[PDB]
């Protein structure tokens, strides 16, 4: 109980579904007193 290398490995194999490997993307959204460089587009209306 001394040391315990923390970087153990998940074993991914189809035999594993609660243990089924899933690829996750996490979005974090924030604004701080600057122009919102992220925007939502608006289409052209015929003039």
């Amino acid at each position, epitope marked *: *109980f001394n040391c*315990y*290398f923390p*970087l*153990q*490995s*998940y*074993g991914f194999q189809p035999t594993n579904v609660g243990y089924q490997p899933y690829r996750v993307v996490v979005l974090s959204f924030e604004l701080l007193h600057a122009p919102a460089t992220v925007c939502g587009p608006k289409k052209s209306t015929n003039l």
Partner: antibody
Amino acid sequence: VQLVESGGGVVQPGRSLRLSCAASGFTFSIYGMHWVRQAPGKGLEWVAVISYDGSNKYYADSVKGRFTISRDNSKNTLYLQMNSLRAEDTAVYYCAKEGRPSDIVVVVAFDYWGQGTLVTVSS
Amino acid sequence: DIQLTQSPSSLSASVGDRVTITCRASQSISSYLNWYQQKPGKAPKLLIYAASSLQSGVPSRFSGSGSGTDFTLTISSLQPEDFATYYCQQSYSTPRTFGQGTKVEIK
């Protein structure tokens, strides 16, 4: 996971030899790596262990001073430098990895071995 | 250097027989023996780790027990593929060492 060994053969007593163990199929750089020998017809005798980073190095009592284990994490290859070889050092040498079941990470077990290479010390 | 002694060194038994292999450590490691199976000419296979827990892919007939200095490898129903040399191995402290091996032979 593959552990292919090479470098064995016949050597006259007292000279030097280098064993090579190429690893593949797993992340080489974060695992401890072992050598184990088995002379013809006798039991398994532990030889040497090297840390993942090559800093921690331990050897069996009979090989202290003469045998040197090494590591190259770039080519994912394990080595054992043999020096002052003698008759009792004639054996089949295996390279192998620590490995664990993960849930039970209180064992630091053993797992997949190399196929083994024959070292015969005879003039 | 902790010494591991296996008893008996060899034994003869028949298919289906209840097979017992004992491993004794020089000092207590108390849950840290690992058992291996080796056929001649091929690398050993881990059967029991932590002295009481089964490896994945190993049949349930293989069971490990014992604690401290007295440990037991048991095969409930001996099978034709179980005839081999079995080694106990401690991982409590460095350097790592092996028992001499118990050869299971055909009676």
